Ligand SMILES: *[C@@H]1O[C@H](CO)[C@@H](O[C@@H]2O[C@H](CO)[C@@H](O[C@@H]3O[C@H](CO)[C@@H](O)[C@H](O)[C@@H]3O)[C@H](O)[C@H]2NC(C)=O)[C@H](O)[C@H]1NC(C)=O
């Protein structure tokens with residue numbers, strides 16, 4: 001309904017709190033799943 | 036420009052921005068205006084007649 005709005009993405013302040021956690025746990029997956 | 040030219044250089048700004056700030060001067064943010072810009076801006080047109 002608003003006039004003059006433009007499409008723009010909104011960043012999440014919670015996003016930096018989760019990007020640094022996925023890398024650590026990825027290594028352990030290959031050490032236990034294959035055997 | 037609005038209120039800005041009483042202090043010096045007048046700054047180009049669209050009108051719909053201006054009175055949307057005067058809403059911030061009574062206690063309601065822009066949510067009142069833009070969510071009803073079509074009707075709200077139309078009433079002032081009729082009020083002048
Ligand atoms: C997110 O951004 C997209 C742009 O990638 C917005 O969608 C597109 O908005 C433009 C606005 O001009 C639309 O263009 C118009 O399309 C009509 C119909 O073809 C045409 O007759 C006009 O001359 C004009 O070109 C475009 O159609 C539209 N695309 C789609 C797929 O809807 C979208 O509105 C933005 N969304 C938000 C939530 O910001």
Ligand SMILES: *[C@@H]1O[C@H](CO)[C@@H](O)[C@H](O)[C@H]1NC(C)=O
Pocket residue numbers: 027031
């Ligand atoms: C992967 O598993 C082996 C099994 O003995 C272990 O020695 C090694 O420390 C593990 N890797 C890491 C990064 O802990």
